């Protein structure tokens, strides 16, 4: 897989995460989430030749199709591998509520 | 079909000491943005100053219960525009308005 | 437990089991309407007490409207 | 899921599920496939707004961020949501040797 | 049982166990190296006679090379 | 490091009749191309011709091995050329090579 601290530390063009924060006000138009104000939620950017970490069968496959044939418009996608979960808090009503969100944060990607 | 009503998002802080003196328009400087507990609730601010010093009060609340032992017309309203309350030495202003965090913005 | 309407589900005879919400999505634009009708569950409400995948198209960004519910087969539209 | 009996029936610029038929000779190089001579591999493509088959809480944040903010140059993916196998025959020596390989044929798209 | 090595196996003292070969490939475009060693599992070499997965630069496309092998701990690379 | 010798792609259709006849060049028309059993393995193409008709033979063959009770010179080679070989009332052609699908084109 390819993680933050290989995509972070030497950047390139092809398939990686990206950092990206994201103010739940500013951004989103979330009023509602008290803590934390943003977060780092980054996502996955870049082209998909073969073999890069290459998701199923049909991501090998269809990578190959566009090695030899990049001009068909058709190729792997650049797609979180696996996830993090943030810890929001939020009131309602009067009491304060600590809520643990998974699959929020990318930390890896894969070609799909 | 039964859809479910959802409640606002209001500033909910309580009673809390206030600088809004003699303003045509107050920011509430309420940190906590809540989703009111009920969905029927809306957005309520209560403006206070005896002899002494000044106090705001923000909280979700149902339309049709007695708040102060008052009533809440034009809760419907998008803004929160206050109006005056008769009390024996004490200055009393409150708003009613149906809109995520209206109750912010106070108007006089 | 909750009993929404599923278009999905073909062998569920188009009805899901839920402990959340039912849902309903409209799409609009230049004559066409797609419906998309699902359960919800209540781990995936976020928060429980109002979440902000059934705030509607005006809270939105006014693409699609949104439509959620708490009674029975209550999803389906129907003119 | 998006799939291929409403991506095949009503085309739309969206994610969906595509045609692609893929000779396994004439598209891969693959001269050992005995049968069959080519398939239907098809894939996924288009953008992806809003609530659009979202595979995670990110997808859906993400979506919603590209929503208020298409300038920005981060969305969700279209990608392949559920995979099918498909039977090849090939000659290993003298004796033929069928075998069945999982995800080789798109049947659904999400947006991850 | 082969025993490779595996830059990505941090809590398995940088090793895989499987019942398949030992994997390499190496990405060189203008002064760089890409170094990825893995294990291949017999299921994922298609066919087990002769993987598609292993075929060299000279007939995947001369983009990177690629290292198949059946001998431990083989799949590391130093001059 | 022991690296795995992969085995190649040969034509494997064995005897098979065959119009190829007085001709520089000929294809196989064997639809069977065939991953060889064994890693050393190369292509092997038999060409005979008695007093009624012709056979042509198509295998993956031992490099070192006798085939027809004759060796394999020339099996490195990327192409498979025919060369004649001595036997009585018998027309006697045969090629090694090695490279994928090289024995499909017999070369006189």
């Known amino acids: 897989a390819l993680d933050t601290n290989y995509c972070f530390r030497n950047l390139e063009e092809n398939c990686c995460v990206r950092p990206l924060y994201i103010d739940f006000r500013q951004d989103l138009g979330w009023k509602w989430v008290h803590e934390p104000k943003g977060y780092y939620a980054n996502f996955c950017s870049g082209p998909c030749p073969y073999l890069r970490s290459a998701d199923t069968t049909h991501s090998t496959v269809l990578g190959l199709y566009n090695t030899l044939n990049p001009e068909a418009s058709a190729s792997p996608c650049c797609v979180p591998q696996d996830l993090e979960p943030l810890t929001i808090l939020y009131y309602v009503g009067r009491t304060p509520k600590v809520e643990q969100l998974s699959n929020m944060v990318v930390k890896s990607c894969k070609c799909s | ?108 | 437990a909750l009993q929404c309407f599923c278009h999905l589900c073909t062998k569920d005879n188009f009805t899901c089991v839920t402990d959340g919400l039912c849902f309903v999505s409209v799409t609009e634009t230049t004559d066409k309407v797609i419906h998309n009708s699902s359960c919800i569950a209540e781990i995936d409400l976020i928060p429980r007490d109002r979440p902000f995948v059934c705030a509607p198209s005006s809270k939105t960004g006014s693409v699609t409207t949104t439509y959620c519910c708490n009674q029975d087969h209550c999803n389906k539209i129907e003119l």
């Open chain 2, 1 to 108: 079909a039964g859809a479910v009503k959802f409640p606002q998002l209001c500033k909910f802080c309580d009673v809390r000491f206030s600088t809004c003196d003699n303003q045509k328009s107050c920011m509430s400087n309420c940190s906590i943005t809540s989703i009111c507990e009920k969905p029927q609730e809306v957005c309520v601010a209560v403006w206070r100053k005896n002899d002494e010093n000044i106090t705001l009060e923000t909280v979700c609340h149902d339309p049709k219960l007695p708040y102060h032992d008052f009533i809440l017309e034009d809760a419907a309203s998008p803004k929160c525009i206050m109006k005056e309350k008769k009390k024996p030495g004490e200055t009393f202003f409150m708003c009613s308005c149906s809109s995520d965090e209206c109750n912010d913005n106070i108007i006089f």
